[PDB]
JSON list of C-alpha atoms in Angstrom, two decimals:
[
{"chain": "A", "resi": 11, "resn": "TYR", "atom": "CA", "xyz": [5.89, 7.20, -13.96]},
{"chain": "A", "resi": 12, "resn": "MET", "atom": "CA", "xyz": [7.13, 3.59, -14.05]},
{"chain": "A", "resi": 13, "resn": "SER", "atom": "CA", "xyz": [8.40, 3.98, -10.48]},
{"chain": "A", "resi": 14, "resn": "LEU", "atom": "CA", "xyz": [4.87, 5.12, -9.64]},
{"chain": "A", "resi": 15, "resn": "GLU", "atom": "CA", "xyz": [3.13, 2.30, -11.50]},
{"chain": "A", "resi": 16, "resn": "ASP", "atom": "CA", "xyz": [5.45, -0.29, -9.95]},
{"chain": "A", "resi": 17, "resn": "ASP", "atom": "CA", "xyz": [4.73, 1.11, -6.50]},
{"chain": "A", "resi": 18, "resn": "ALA", "atom": "CA", "xyz": [0.98, 1.33, -7.11]},
{"chain": "A", "resi": 19, "resn": "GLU", "atom": "CA", "xyz": [0.85, -2.32, -8.20]},
{"chain": "A", "resi": 20, "resn": "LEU", "atom": "CA", "xyz": [2.90, -3.36, -5.16]},
{"chain": "A", "resi": 21, "resn": "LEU", "atom": "CA", "xyz": [0.37, -1.69, -2.83]},
{"chain": "A", "resi": 22, "resn": "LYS", "atom": "CA", "xyz": [-2.57, -3.11, -4.78]},
{"chain": "A", "resi": 23, "resn": "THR", "atom": "CA", "xyz": [-1.22, -6.64, -4.43]},
{"chain": "A", "resi": 24, "resn": "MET", "atom": "CA", "xyz": [-0.68, -6.18, -0.68]},
{"chain": "A", "resi": 25, "resn": "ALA", "atom": "CA", "xyz": [-4.08, -4.51, -0.13]},
{"chain": "A", "resi": 26, "resn": "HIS", "atom": "CA", "xyz": [-5.96, -7.46, 1.42]},
{"chain": "A", "resi": 27, "resn": "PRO", "atom": "CA", "xyz": [-6.21, -8.34, 5.13]},
{"chain": "A", "resi": 28, "resn": "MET", "atom": "CA", "xyz": [-5.02, -11.94, 4.88]},
{"chain": "A", "resi": 29, "resn": "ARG", "atom": "CA", "xyz": [-2.27, -10.98, 2.46]},
{"chain": "A", "resi": 30, "resn": "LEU", "atom": "CA", "xyz": [-0.93, -8.49, 4.99]},
{"chain": "A", "resi": 31, "resn": "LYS", "atom": "CA", "xyz": [-1.13, -11.21, 7.61]},
{"chain": "A", "resi": 32, "resn": "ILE", "atom": "CA", "xyz": [0.84, -13.51, 5.31]},
{"chain": "A", "resi": 33, "resn": "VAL", "atom": "CA", "xyz": [3.44, -10.80, 4.61]},
{"chain": "A", "resi": 34, "resn": "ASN", "atom": "CA", "xyz": [3.79, -10.04, 8.32]},
{"chain": "A", "resi": 35, "resn": "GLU", "atom": "CA", "xyz": [4.39, -13.73, 9.09]},
{"chain": "A", "resi": 36, "resn": "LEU", "atom": "CA", "xyz": [7.02, -13.94, 6.35]},
{"chain": "A", "resi": 37, "resn": "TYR", "atom": "CA", "xyz": [8.63, -10.83, 7.81]},
{"chain": "A", "resi": 38, "resn": "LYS", "atom": "CA", "xyz": [8.69, -12.44, 11.26]},
{"chain": "A", "resi": 39, "resn": "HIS", "atom": "CA", "xyz": [9.99, -15.78, 9.96]},
{"chain": "A", "resi": 40, "resn": "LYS", "atom": "CA", "xyz": [12.00, -14.75, 6.89]},
{"chain": "A", "resi": 41, "resn": "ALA", "atom": "CA", "xyz": [10.80, -17.79, 4.89]},
{"chain": "A", "resi": 42, "resn": "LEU", "atom": "CA", "xyz": [7.90, -20.24, 5.33]},
{"chain": "A", "resi": 43, "resn": "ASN", "atom": "CA", "xyz": [6.52, -23.12, 3.29]},
{"chain": "A", "resi": 44, "resn": "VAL", "atom": "CA", "xyz": [2.83, -23.39, 2.50]},
{"chain": "A", "resi": 45, "resn": "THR", "atom": "CA", "xyz": [2.20, -25.95, 5.24]},
{"chain": "A", "resi": 46, "resn": "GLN", "atom": "CA", "xyz": [3.72, -23.67, 7.86]},
{"chain": "A", "resi": 47, "resn": "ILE", "atom": "CA", "xyz": [1.78, -20.64, 6.61]},
{"chain": "A", "resi": 48, "resn": "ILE", "atom": "CA", "xyz": [-1.49, -22.61, 6.71]},
{"chain": "A", "resi": 49, "resn": "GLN", "atom": "CA", "xyz": [-0.71, -23.81, 10.24]},
{"chain": "A", "resi": 50, "resn": "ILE", "atom": "CA", "xyz": [-0.13, -20.29, 11.57]},
{"chain": "A", "resi": 51, "resn": "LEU", "atom": "CA", "xyz": [-3.10, -18.70, 9.80]},
{"chain": "A", "resi": 52, "resn": "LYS", "atom": "CA", "xyz": [-5.56, -21.54, 10.45]},
{"chain": "A", "resi": 53, "resn": "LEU", "atom": "CA", "xyz": [-7.29, -21.01, 7.10]},
{"chain": "A", "resi": 54, "resn": "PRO", "atom": "CA", "xyz": [-8.45, -23.30, 4.29]},
{"chain": "A", "resi": 55, "resn": "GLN", "atom": "CA", "xyz": [-5.55, -24.69, 2.26]},
{"chain": "A", "resi": 56, "resn": "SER", "atom": "CA", "xyz": [-7.06, -23.26, -0.93]},
{"chain": "A", "resi": 57, "resn": "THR", "atom": "CA", "xyz": [-7.43, -19.79, 0.59]},
{"chain": "A", "resi": 58, "resn": "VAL", "atom": "CA", "xyz": [-3.73, -19.63, 1.41]},
{"chain": "A", "resi": 59, "resn": "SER", "atom": "CA", "xyz": [-2.68, -21.05, -1.97]},
{"chain": "A", "resi": 60, "resn": "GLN", "atom": "CA", "xyz": [-4.81, -18.51, -3.83]},
{"chain": "A", "resi": 61, "resn": "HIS", "atom": "CA", "xyz": [-3.27, -15.61, -1.88]},
{"chain": "A", "resi": 62, "resn": "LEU", "atom": "CA", "xyz": [0.28, -16.89, -2.33]},
{"chain": "A", "resi": 63, "resn": "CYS", "atom": "CA", "xyz": [-0.29, -17.32, -6.06]},
{"chain": "A", "resi": 64, "resn": "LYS", "atom": "CA", "xyz": [-1.47, -13.72, -6.54]},
{"chain": "A", "resi": 65, "resn": "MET", "atom": "CA", "xyz": [1.43, -12.37, -4.45]},
{"chain": "A", "resi": 66, "resn": "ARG", "atom": "CA", "xyz": [4.17, -14.37, -6.19]},
{"chain": "A", "resi": 67, "resn": "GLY", "atom": "CA", "xyz": [6.36, -12.22, -8.39]},
{"chain": "A", "resi": 68, "resn": "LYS", "atom": "CA", "xyz": [5.98, -8.61, -7.28]},
{"chain": "A", "resi": 69, "resn": "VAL", "atom": "CA", "xyz": [5.48, -9.12, -3.54]},
{"chain": "A", "resi": 70, "resn": "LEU", "atom": "CA", "xyz": [6.87, -12.57, -2.74]},
{"chain": "A", "resi": 71, "resn": "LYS", "atom": "CA", "xyz": [9.58, -14.78, -4.14]},
{"chain": "A", "resi": 72, "resn": "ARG", "atom": "CA", "xyz": [9.25, -18.54, -4.35]},
{"chain": "A", "resi": 73, "resn": "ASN", "atom": "CA", "xyz": [12.11, -20.94, -3.59]},
{"chain": "A", "resi": 74, "resn": "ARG", "atom": "CA", "xyz": [12.17, -24.72, -3.78]},
{"chain": "A", "resi": 75, "resn": "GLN", "atom": "CA", "xyz": [13.95, -26.77, -1.13]},
{"chain": "A", "resi": 76, "resn": "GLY", "atom": "CA", "xyz": [13.50, -30.50, -1.61]},
{"chain": "A", "resi": 77, "resn": "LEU", "atom": "CA", "xyz": [9.77, -31.02, -2.02]},
{"chain": "A", "resi": 78, "resn": "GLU", "atom": "CA", "xyz": [8.82, -27.99, 0.05]},
{"chain": "A", "resi": 79, "resn": "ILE", "atom": "CA", "xyz": [8.17, -24.59, -1.50]},
{"chain": "A", "resi": 80, "resn": "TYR", "atom": "CA", "xyz": [9.36, -21.63, 0.57]},
{"chain": "A", "resi": 81, "resn": "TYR", "atom": "CA", "xyz": [8.01, -18.10, 0.28]},
{"chain": "A", "resi": 82, "resn": "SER", "atom": "CA", "xyz": [9.82, -14.95, 1.31]},
{"chain": "A", "resi": 83, "resn": "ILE", "atom": "CA", "xyz": [9.48, -11.21, 0.74]},
{"chain": "A", "resi": 84, "resn": "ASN", "atom": "CA", "xyz": [10.79, -10.22, -2.69]},
{"chain": "A", "resi": 85, "resn": "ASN", "atom": "CA", "xyz": [11.21, -6.45, -2.34]},
{"chain": "A", "resi": 86, "resn": "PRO", "atom": "CA", "xyz": [12.72, -4.18, 0.37]},
{"chain": "A", "resi": 87, "resn": "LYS", "atom": "CA", "xyz": [9.72, -1.84, -0.03]},
{"chain": "A", "resi": 88, "resn": "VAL", "atom": "CA", "xyz": [7.36, -4.62, 1.10]},
{"chain": "A", "resi": 89, "resn": "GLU", "atom": "CA", "xyz": [9.34, -5.22, 4.27]},
{"chain": "A", "resi": 90, "resn": "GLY", "atom": "CA", "xyz": [9.54, -1.51, 5.03]},
{"chain": "A", "resi": 91, "resn": "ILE", "atom": "CA", "xyz": [5.76, -1.14, 4.61]},
{"chain": "A", "resi": 92, "resn": "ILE", "atom": "CA", "xyz": [4.91, -4.16, 6.75]},
{"chain": "A", "resi": 93, "resn": "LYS", "atom": "CA", "xyz": [7.16, -2.86, 9.56]},
{"chain": "A", "resi": 94, "resn": "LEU", "atom": "CA", "xyz": [5.47, 0.55, 9.43]},
{"chain": "A", "resi": 95, "resn": "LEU", "atom": "CA", "xyz": [2.01, -1.04, 9.64]},
{"chain": "A", "resi": 96, "resn": "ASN", "atom": "CA", "xyz": [2.68, -3.31, 12.63]},
{"chain": "B", "resi": 11, "resn": "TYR", "atom": "CA", "xyz": [-5.57, 2.53, 16.49]},
{"chain": "B", "resi": 12, "resn": "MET", "atom": "CA", "xyz": [-6.11, 0.90, 13.11]},
{"chain": "B", "resi": 13, "resn": "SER", "atom": "CA", "xyz": [-7.19, -2.64, 12.32]},
{"chain": "B", "resi": 14, "resn": "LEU", "atom": "CA", "xyz": [-5.78, -5.09, 9.80]},
{"chain": "B", "resi": 15, "resn": "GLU", "atom": "CA", "xyz": [-8.69, -4.11, 7.56]},
{"chain": "B", "resi": 16, "resn": "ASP", "atom": "CA", "xyz": [-7.92, -0.39, 7.99]},
{"chain": "B", "resi": 17, "resn": "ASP", "atom": "CA", "xyz": [-4.31, -1.03, 6.96]},
{"chain": "B", "resi": 18, "resn": "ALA", "atom": "CA", "xyz": [-5.38, -3.05, 3.90]},
{"chain": "B", "resi": 19, "resn": "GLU", "atom": "CA", "xyz": [-7.91, -0.35, 2.95]},
{"chain": "B", "resi": 20, "resn": "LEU", "atom": "CA", "xyz": [-5.21, 2.33, 3.35]},
{"chain": "B", "resi": 21, "resn": "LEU", "atom": "CA", "xyz": [-2.94, 0.58, 0.87]},
{"chain": "B", "resi": 22, "resn": "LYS", "atom": "CA", "xyz": [-5.86, -0.01, -1.50]},
{"chain": "B", "resi": 23, "resn": "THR", "atom": "CA", "xyz": [-6.78, 3.69, -1.46]},
{"chain": "B", "resi": 24, "resn": "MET", "atom": "CA", "xyz": [-3.16, 4.71, -2.22]},
{"chain": "B", "resi": 25, "resn": "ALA", "atom": "CA", "xyz": [-2.72, 2.01, -4.89]},
{"chain": "B", "resi": 26, "resn": "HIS", "atom": "CA", "xyz": [-2.99, 4.33, -7.93]},
{"chain": "B", "resi": 27, "resn": "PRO", "atom": "CA", "xyz": [-0.10, 6.14, -9.70]},
{"chain": "B", "resi": 28, "resn": "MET", "atom": "CA", "xyz": [-1.66, 9.60, -9.63]},
{"chain": "B", "resi": 29, "resn": "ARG", "atom": "CA", "xyz": [-2.76, 9.14, -6.03]},
{"chain": "B", "resi": 30, "resn": "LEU", "atom": "CA", "xyz": [0.80, 8.33, -5.03]},
{"chain": "B", "resi": 31, "resn": "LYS", "atom": "CA", "xyz": [1.85, 11.48, -6.91]},
{"chain": "B", "resi": 32, "resn": "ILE", "atom": "CA", "xyz": [-0.67, 13.54, -4.94]},
{"chain": "B", "resi": 33, "resn": "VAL", "atom": "CA", "xyz": [0.58, 12.15, -1.63]},
{"chain": "B", "resi": 34, "resn": "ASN", "atom": "CA", "xyz": [4.21, 12.76, -2.60]},
{"chain": "B", "resi": 35, "resn": "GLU", "atom": "CA", "xyz": [3.38, 16.37, -3.51]},
{"chain": "B", "resi": 36, "resn": "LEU", "atom": "CA", "xyz": [1.59, 16.98, -0.20]},
{"chain": "B", "resi": 37, "resn": "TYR", "atom": "CA", "xyz": [4.58, 15.45, 1.55]},
{"chain": "B", "resi": 38, "resn": "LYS", "atom": "CA", "xyz": [6.84, 17.97, -0.18]},
{"chain": "B", "resi": 39, "resn": "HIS", "atom": "CA", "xyz": [4.56, 21.03, -0.04]},
{"chain": "B", "resi": 40, "resn": "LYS", "atom": "CA", "xyz": [2.64, 20.19, 3.17]},
{"chain": "B", "resi": 41, "resn": "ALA", "atom": "CA", "xyz": [-0.52, 22.01, 2.07]},
{"chain": "B", "resi": 42, "resn": "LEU", "atom": "CA", "xyz": [-2.14, 22.25, -1.36]},
{"chain": "B", "resi": 43, "resn": "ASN", "atom": "CA", "xyz": [-5.55, 23.27, -2.68]},
{"chain": "B", "resi": 44, "resn": "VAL", "atom": "CA", "xyz": [-7.21, 21.60, -5.67]},
{"chain": "B", "resi": 45, "resn": "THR", "atom": "CA", "xyz": [-5.98, 24.20, -8.17]},
{"chain": "B", "resi": 46, "resn": "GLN", "atom": "CA", "xyz": [-2.36, 23.76, -7.05]},
{"chain": "B", "resi": 47, "resn": "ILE", "atom": "CA", "xyz": [-2.79, 19.99, -7.39]},
{"chain": "B", "resi": 48, "resn": "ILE", "atom": "CA", "xyz": [-4.41, 20.21, -10.82]},
{"chain": "B", "resi": 49, "resn": "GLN", "atom": "CA", "xyz": [-1.55, 22.42, -12.03]},
{"chain": "B", "resi": 50, "resn": "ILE", "atom": "CA", "xyz": [1.14, 20.16, -10.54]},
{"chain": "B", "resi": 51, "resn": "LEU", "atom": "CA", "xyz": [-0.31, 16.93, -11.93]},
{"chain": "B", "resi": 52, "resn": "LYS", "atom": "CA", "xyz": [-1.48, 18.42, -15.24]},
{"chain": "B", "resi": 53, "resn": "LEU", "atom": "CA", "xyz": [-4.70, 16.41, -15.08]},
{"chain": "B", "resi": 54, "resn": "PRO", "atom": "CA", "xyz": [-8.38, 17.29, -15.62]},
{"chain": "B", "resi": 55, "resn": "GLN", "atom": "CA", "xyz": [-10.11, 18.81, -12.59]},
{"chain": "B", "resi": 56, "resn": "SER", "atom": "CA", "xyz": [-12.63, 15.98, -12.84]},
{"chain": "B", "resi": 57, "resn": "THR", "atom": "CA", "xyz": [-9.95, 13.31, -12.47]},
{"chain": "B", "resi": 58, "resn": "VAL", "atom": "CA", "xyz": [-8.17, 15.11, -9.62]},
{"chain": "B", "resi": 59, "resn": "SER", "atom": "CA", "xyz": [-11.40, 15.75, -7.71]},
{"chain": "B", "resi": 60, "resn": "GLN", "atom": "CA", "xyz": [-12.34, 12.08, -7.89]},
{"chain": "B", "resi": 61, "resn": "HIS", "atom": "CA", "xyz": [-8.98, 10.98, -6.50]},
{"chain": "B", "resi": 62, "resn": "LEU", "atom": "CA", "xyz": [-9.23, 13.53, -3.69]},
{"chain": "B", "resi": 63, "resn": "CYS", "atom": "CA", "xyz": [-12.78, 12.39, -2.95]},
{"chain": "B", "resi": 64, "resn": "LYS", "atom": "CA", "xyz": [-11.67, 8.75, -2.64]},
{"chain": "B", "resi": 65, "resn": "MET", "atom": "CA", "xyz": [-8.63, 9.70, -0.52]},
{"chain": "B", "resi": 66, "resn": "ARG", "atom": "CA", "xyz": [-10.26, 12.18, 1.87]},
{"chain": "B", "resi": 67, "resn": "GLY", "atom": "CA", "xyz": [-10.73, 10.77, 5.35]},
{"chain": "B", "resi": 68, "resn": "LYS", "atom": "CA", "xyz": [-8.56, 7.72, 4.79]},
{"chain": "B", "resi": 69, "resn": "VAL", "atom": "CA", "xyz": [-5.32, 8.93, 3.25]},
{"chain": "B", "resi": 70, "resn": "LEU", "atom": "CA", "xyz": [-5.67, 12.72, 3.19]},
{"chain": "B", "resi": 71, "resn": "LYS", "atom": "CA", "xyz": [-7.07, 15.39, 5.49]},
{"chain": "B", "resi": 72, "resn": "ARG", "atom": "CA", "xyz": [-9.31, 18.14, 4.11]},
{"chain": "B", "resi": 73, "resn": "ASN", "atom": "CA", "xyz": [-8.77, 21.55, 5.74]},
{"chain": "B", "resi": 74, "resn": "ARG", "atom": "CA", "xyz": [-10.61, 24.85, 5.56]},
{"chain": "B", "resi": 75, "resn": "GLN", "atom": "CA", "xyz": [-9.11, 28.32, 6.09]},
{"chain": "B", "resi": 76, "resn": "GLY", "atom": "CA", "xyz": [-11.44, 31.15, 5.15]},
{"chain": "B", "resi": 77, "resn": "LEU", "atom": "CA", "xyz": [-12.47, 30.62, 1.54]},
{"chain": "B", "resi": 78, "resn": "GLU", "atom": "CA", "xyz": [-9.69, 28.09, 0.96]},
{"chain": "B", "resi": 79, "resn": "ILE", "atom": "CA", "xyz": [-9.98, 24.32, 1.14]},
{"chain": "B", "resi": 80, "resn": "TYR", "atom": "CA", "xyz": [-6.57, 22.62, 1.17]},
{"chain": "B", "resi": 81, "resn": "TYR", "atom": "CA", "xyz": [-5.28, 19.11, 1.70]},
{"chain": "B", "resi": 82, "resn": "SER", "atom": "CA", "xyz": [-2.61, 17.74, 3.98]},
{"chain": "B", "resi": 83, "resn": "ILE", "atom": "CA", "xyz": [-1.27, 14.46, 5.35]},
{"chain": "B", "resi": 84, "resn": "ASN", "atom": "CA", "xyz": [-2.07, 13.89, 9.02]},
{"chain": "B", "resi": 85, "resn": "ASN", "atom": "CA", "xyz": [-1.82, 10.08, 9.14]},
{"chain": "B", "resi": 86, "resn": "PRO", "atom": "CA", "xyz": [1.67, 8.97, 10.26]},
{"chain": "B", "resi": 87, "resn": "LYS", "atom": "CA", "xyz": [1.38, 5.73, 8.27]},
{"chain": "B", "resi": 88, "resn": "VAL", "atom": "CA", "xyz": [0.73, 7.60, 5.02]},
{"chain": "B", "resi": 89, "resn": "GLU", "atom": "CA", "xyz": [3.75, 9.85, 5.50]},
{"chain": "B", "resi": 90, "resn": "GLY", "atom": "CA", "xyz": [5.86, 6.85, 6.46]},
{"chain": "B", "resi": 91, "resn": "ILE", "atom": "CA", "xyz": [4.84, 4.92, 3.35]},
{"chain": "B", "resi": 92, "resn": "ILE", "atom": "CA", "xyz": [5.34, 7.73, 0.87]},
{"chain": "B", "resi": 93, "resn": "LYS", "atom": "CA", "xyz": [8.85, 8.34, 2.22]},
{"chain": "B", "resi": 94, "resn": "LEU", "atom": "CA", "xyz": [9.75, 4.65, 1.87]},
{"chain": "B", "resi": 95, "resn": "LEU", "atom": "CA", "xyz": [8.48, 4.65, -1.70]},
{"chain": "B", "resi": 96, "resn": "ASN", "atom": "CA", "xyz": [10.71, 7.47, -2.94]}
]
């Protein structure tokens, strides 16, 4: 059941159009900082930050390089799903 | 062809433990009626029917053969995702 709950929560977290767009970009670029993500998506800074915040942990991993914060996919399942969808 | 919104909505519809169980079972048995599903999941008919109702047309296909109504997976993305999740 835990494998099912984990998986259900993963899908739930990814289940938003702009979040899938963010995950796809991270899949295409491996790792991106918030500024880069904003640039590509052309969305309000706060919109991107809100999405990244909700995704951090189960879908994305956060890494700090200097003063920049880099996001990348934190689970092989996420990458597999994004590939299947695009 | 499916849009970004269709993909997000697909994940949202599958984002429930028992729904993932249902999809996995259909993946393994190919065709199952409500009674077979209720007996496999060991859940109330009310609960199972609601999940099937929400999934029909987006995640699952409803089929009729004589007096029997059975479900199957006809969306490639759904099959692809359930395989990746196991």
